[PDB]
């Protein structure tokens, strides 16, 4: 007919046309973490919105290389280098430094998240913005690997509310990646989520990672529908706006009948 008919029982996912200014890349959050707190970053609640009832630390915004790699420091006989976990053996030592002489179970100061001073031992963060699709098609996003606990939400009322980024923290727990670190142990790799989404929309896109101890890790990926990957490196695709909650036209239900 003259017009598609729309996704079935309003199954597509809400996205955004803010109109104000688009800055690149997404804001961080940073909040309070406690060392060795392997049970609070294992709620839904905490992960999708408590994490903000904790001290919030700071932010850096305009970030648009968004994965986590962070190695702690091994103290060796020729200096204090970071040391990639699966150099990491013993008791403990670092591939080509020798034995180590630093705990593995303090905190650590480092700027290596976003170049905010913090502890990346033990920390959570909230990454905003909202992903740009070039092209309409499938999006499965993903985390390579989990270390320690992380959500990925994309959406209108998943993420957040259109024109509304800088706003307390939703409520949703319907992620589009669940990678809630698992009560019982355990968790595979390359955990996965799918969004169909129409070009030209700005779709709100929330991840909230947390550390527990030592080594951080969180390769986050985007499968595009011409089947090419983007990884790390989202400069292109992530862009943040300032609140404009007056903005009546903001939000598109249906990006596939708008
Ligand atoms: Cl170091
Ligand atoms: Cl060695
Ligand atoms: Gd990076
Ligand atoms: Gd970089
Ligand atoms: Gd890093
Ligand atoms: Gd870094
Ligand atoms: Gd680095
Ligand atoms: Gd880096
Ligand atoms: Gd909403
Ligand atoms: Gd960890
Ligand atoms: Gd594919
Ligand atoms: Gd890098
Ligand atoms: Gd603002």
Not at 165 to 184: H, L, M, Y
Request: glycine share 10%; hydrophobic share 30%.
């Amino acid at each position: 007919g003259l017009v598609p008919r729309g996704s079935h029982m309003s199954g597509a996912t809400e996205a955004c046309l803010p109109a104000g200014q688009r800055k690149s890349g997404m804001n961080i959050n940073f909040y309070q973490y406690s060392l060795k707190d392997s049970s609070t970053y294992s709620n839904a609640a905490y992960m999708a919105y408590g994490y903000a009832s904790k001290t919030k630390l700071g932010s850096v915004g305009g970030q648009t290389d968004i994965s986590i790699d962070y190695n702690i420091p091994c103290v060796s006989s020729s200096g204090t280098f970071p040391c990639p976990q699966e150099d990491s053996y013993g008791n403990w030592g670092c591939k080509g430094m020798g034995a180590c002489s630093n705990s593995q179970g303090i905190a650590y100061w480092s700027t290596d998240l976003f170049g905010f001073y913090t502890t990346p031992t033990n920390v959570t963060l909230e990454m905003t913005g909202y992903f740009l699709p070039p092209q309409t098609g499938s999006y499965t996003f993903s985390f390579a690997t989990v270390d320690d606990s992380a959500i990925l939400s994309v959406g209108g009322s998943i993420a957040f509310e259109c024109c509304a980024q800088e706003q307390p923290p939703i409520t949703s727990t319907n992620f589009t990646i669940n990678g809630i670190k698992p009560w019982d142990g355990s968790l595979p790799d390359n955990i996965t989520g799918t969004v169909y989404m129409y070009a030209g929309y700005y779709y709100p896109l929330k991840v909230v990672y947390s550390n527990a101890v030592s080594w951080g890790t969180l390769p986050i990926s985007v499968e595009l529908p011409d089947g090419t990957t983007v990884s790390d490196n989202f400069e292109g695709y992530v862009y943040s706006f300032d609140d404009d909650l007056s903005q009546s036209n903001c939000t598109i239900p249906d990006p596939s009948i708008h």
